[PDB]
Amino acid sequence: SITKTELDGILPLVARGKVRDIYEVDAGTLLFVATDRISAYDVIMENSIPEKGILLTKLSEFWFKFLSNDVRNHLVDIAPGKTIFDYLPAKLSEPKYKTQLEDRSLLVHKHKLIPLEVIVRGYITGSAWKEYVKTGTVHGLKQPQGLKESQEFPEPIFTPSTKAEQGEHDENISPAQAAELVGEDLSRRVAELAVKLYSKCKDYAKEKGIIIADTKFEFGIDEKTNEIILVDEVLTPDSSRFWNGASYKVGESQDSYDKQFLRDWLTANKLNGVNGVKMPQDIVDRTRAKYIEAYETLTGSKWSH
Ligand SMILES: *OP(=O)(O)OC[C@H]1O[C@@H](n2cnc3c(N)ncnc32)[C@H](O)[C@@H]1O
Ligand SMILES: Nc1ncnc2c1ncn2[C@@H]1O[C@H](COP(=O)(O)O)[C@@H](O)[C@H]1O
Ligand SMILES: [Mg+2]
Numbered sequence: 047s048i049t050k051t052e053l054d055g056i057l058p059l060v061a062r063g064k065v066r067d068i069y070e071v072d073a074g075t076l077l078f079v080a081t082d083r084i085s086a087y088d089v090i091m092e093n094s095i096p097e098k099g100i101l102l103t104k105l106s107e108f109w110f111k112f113l114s115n116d117v118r119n120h121l122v123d124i125a126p127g128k129t130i131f132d133y134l135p136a137k138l139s140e141p142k143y144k145t146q147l148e149d150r151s152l153l154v155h156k157h158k159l160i161p162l163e164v165i166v167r168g169y170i171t172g173s174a175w176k177e178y179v180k181t182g183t184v185h186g187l188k189q190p191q192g193l194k195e196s197q198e199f200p201e202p203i204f205t206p207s208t209k210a211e212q213g214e215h216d217e218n219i220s221p222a223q224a225a226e227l228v229g230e231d232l233s234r235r236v237a238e239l240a241v242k243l244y245s246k247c248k249d250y251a252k253e254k255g256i257i258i259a260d261t262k263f264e265f266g267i268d269e270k271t272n273e274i275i276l277v278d279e280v281l282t283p284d285s286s287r288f289w290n291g292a293s294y295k296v297g298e299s300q301d302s303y304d305k306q307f308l309r310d311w312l313t314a315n316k317l318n319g320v321n322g323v324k325m326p327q328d329i330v331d332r333t334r335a336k337y338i339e340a341y342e343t344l345t346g347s348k349w350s351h
């Protein structure tokens with residue numbers, strides 16, 4: 047279990063997010079290390095979910111491979127017979143550093159980001175449901191009358207939000223606003239590509255028993271070639287709303303696939319939003335089992351006995 051990486055200056059730390067520790071390898075190259083930290087209600091838990099970061103990294107690698115014909119991604123192309131350790135300072139191969147990084151790290155090319163959170167929704171829930179009940183719209187887009195809670199949209203919809211610089215929160219915008227923001231032609235290409243990727247993964251996951259209700263993509267742009275690049279993490283339970291397909295019912299709220307046990311435990315104790323909370327062991331074990339189940343389900347691989 048890894049909560050926080052400590053590489054002792056061997057690589058420059060760029061930032062610790064909720065879940066990832068980010069290191070700079072060179073001017074053009076970052077190392078993303080997924081830790082075993084978990085958040086709920088915008089707060090990180092004190093203890094970790096063991097191997098959560100390995101599972102999510104392996105899941106992300108799976109999706110990048112699944113989509114390799116559909117879009118370029120930011121992964122560094124590691125040469126046959128080499129590992130990420132051959133691209134890093136030799137000292138990171140010592141067991142004390144190696145164990146913090148192995149199986150949970152992605153070596154990626156730094157790119158200029160398209161300044162949008164590219165959210166695509168296949169089912170109406172969360173903020174989209176709230177807005178719809180009130181106004182009959184989602185990001186100003188007119189919706190059909192009579193949608194029920196958690197119902198599939200007729201087609202997946204592109205519902206971008208701004209990507210706010212530190213110090214402020216992300217605003218929901220309409221596709222026309224995204225066009226003013228990033229350019230008409232670019233915004234159309236983004237929408238086309240995001241809907242294409244989401245639909246493909248949504249259909250695949252549904253056959254495996256998981257409903258991906260919505261997901262957040264982030265895209266970079268190669269300004270030489272004009273190509274859009276998939277960056278960040280892709281289609282994990284931290285970046286997407288995963289629902290259990292077997293229990294899925296229109297006209298109801300759905301349980302969080304991964305975080306329901308944790309959420310119920312916190313709300314029952316009124317600990318939501320409270321700092322320094324330690325999850326009880328049975329909460330840890332139950333939550334860990336879900337990450338493993340998501341992994342085995344989507345990937346077809348067994349984790350262990
Ligand atoms: O999830 P997070 O808040 O830790 O992400 C850190 C920041 O890094 C950006 N990101 C993701 N992928 C890239 C690439 N390849 N190049 C440059 N920045 C990248 C995320 O947008 C987030 O702001
Ligand atoms: N950029 C990278 N960062 C971390 N791991 C990688 C990266 N590229 C490939 N891998 C992993 O290295 C192994 C070799 O697979 P591959 O090179 O895609 O045939 C797989 O487990 C990959 O997921
Ligand atoms: Mg999660």
